[PDB]
Amino acid sequence: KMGLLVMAYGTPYKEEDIERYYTHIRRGRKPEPEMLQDLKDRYEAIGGISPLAQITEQQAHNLEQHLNEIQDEITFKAYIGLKHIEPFIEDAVAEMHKDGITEAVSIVLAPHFSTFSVQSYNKRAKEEAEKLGGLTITSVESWYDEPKFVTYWVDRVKETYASMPEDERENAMLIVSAHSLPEKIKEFGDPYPDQLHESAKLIAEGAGVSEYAVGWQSEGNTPDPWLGPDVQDLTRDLFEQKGYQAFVYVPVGFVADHLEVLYDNDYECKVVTDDIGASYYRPEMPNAKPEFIDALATVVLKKLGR
Numbered sequence: 001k002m003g004l005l006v007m008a009y010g011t012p013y014k015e016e017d018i019e020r021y022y023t024h025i026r027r028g029r030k031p032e033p034e035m036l037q038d039l040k041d042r043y044e045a046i047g048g049i050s051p052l053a054q055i056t057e058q059q060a061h062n063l064e065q066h067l068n069e070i071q072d073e074i075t076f077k078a079y080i081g082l083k084h085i086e087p088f089i090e091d092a093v094a095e096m097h098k099d100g101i102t103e104a105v106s107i108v109l110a111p112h113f114s115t116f117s118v119q120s121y122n123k124r125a126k127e128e129a130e131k132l133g134g135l136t137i138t139s140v141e142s143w144y145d146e147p148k149f150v151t152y153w154v155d156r157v158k159e160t161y162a163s164m165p166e167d168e169r170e171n172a173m174l175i176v177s178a179h180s181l182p183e184k185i186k187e188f189g190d191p192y193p194d195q196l197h198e199s200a201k202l203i204a205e206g207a208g209v210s211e212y213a214v215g216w217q218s219e220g221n222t223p224d225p226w227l228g229p230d231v232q233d234l235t236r237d238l239f240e241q242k243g244y245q246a247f248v249y250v251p252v253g254f255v256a257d258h259l260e261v262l263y264d265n266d267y268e269c270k271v272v273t274d275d276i277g278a279s280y281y282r283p284e285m286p287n288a289k290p291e292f293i294d295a296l297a298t299v300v301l302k303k304l305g306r
């Protein structure tokens with residue numbers, strides 16, 4: 001029996017848990033009332049918070065199910081570890097340990113490696129495992145380049161482009177993005193910016209889309225400079241530059257229909273496309289779909305030499 005530690009940033013499971021979630025993200029400081037209410041407003045705006053946490057749960061359960069289905073060597077048992085929501089990463093490691101798991105494979109629900117996301121989770125996990133003793137975790141570090149994951153986005157882009165009118169098809173701009181992080185990740189030689197660029201190149205070339213740009217989104221609000229340009233500004237500059245009639249956003253850095261996509265893309269980016277004369281396109285996110293879950297299974301099996 002192999003442990004399958006699936007990690008993510010996490011989103012509150014209940015509306016009532018948003019403040020604690022915000023407090024945790026703020027490292028122990030309660031959000032100001034206005035700050036808090038505004039986050040609550042954004043979840044409402046996208047339909048409510050309830051469905052969100054459930055996607056991550058299904059991604060992990062389905063990956064567990066599929067892995068145990070496609071091969072008969074290893075029996076996997078999924079354990080979800082979240083950065084800012086319970087169960088926390090350490091809690092999930094403590095539970096695998098308590099359950100008698102001695103070997104575990106972990107994967108983060110973010111294809112691109114970065115010190116702040118992927119590396120941070122793996123470290124916290126391997127550290128709690130050492131402290132407990134007798135449990136070794138083999139961690140996946142990046143998987144933006146898994147042929148099957150690339151193909152999932154390639155087909156979705158091909159579909160969207162073949163689905164637009166000719167006036168737009170040949171005057172469109174593809175925007176591949178990921179979650180922004182403080183520029184100071186450079187101090188650690190964080191390849192994250194490069195991985196989004198390769199991720200973008202792979203998808204555009206695969207879909208045969210010639211015009212594309214790389215952007216960042218959802219930067220947090222801190223004193224430090226975050227990776228840019230942001231998808232909002234990038235869209236505007238490319239429109240003033242060449243007058244694109246359609247913008248196709250591929251938030252490849254995200255795996256589900258969370259706030260960053262439903263709101264930061266579907267809303268804020270459409271605002272710009274609306275404020276300008278272009279049409280808004282954002283292909284279906286991976287979520288827990290079979291094609292995506294198979295890609296992840298393949299990622300996990302490869303990591304194990306299977």
Ligand SMILES: [Mg+2]
Binds near residue numbers: 218219264
């Ligand atoms: Mg924002």
